[PDB]
Amino acid sequence: RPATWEESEEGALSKATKYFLLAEMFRGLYVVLEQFFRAPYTIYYPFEKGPVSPRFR
Amino acid sequence: MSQVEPGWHFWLGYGVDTAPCNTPKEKLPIRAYPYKFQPNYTGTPGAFVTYNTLKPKISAWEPVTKQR
Secondary structure, three states: OOOOOOOOOOOHHHHHHHHHOOHHHHHHHHHHHHHHOOOOOOOOOOOOOOOOOOOOO | OOOOOHHHHHHHOOOOOOOOOOOOOOOOOOOOOOOOOOOOOOOOOOOOOOOOOOOOOOOOOOOOOOOO
């Protein structure tokens, strides 16, 4: 059976701090901020070609 | 991209490790004619035109008259 509100380990203050301070939103924000500081994948096409296997047609 | 030579085109695209300067003469194909290298001429007046490689399928009669 799904738990009621009273049988929860989190306090109301602890849960609602995550509510009004947007916790997991900031976590997902920090993910793509980490991605700002890494190496892109783009190759420059008429100067650099992508993969070739000999089987290609 | 069409201006790069065929044996080099496979190397720039990471098909072969050894460039066509450093391949042996065994992997050089033997030919009996000279090489030309036309890149691509689309829009240029030297574009390819297609045509019939063979003559029409059923011939007609070339007329000769006869004095009876």
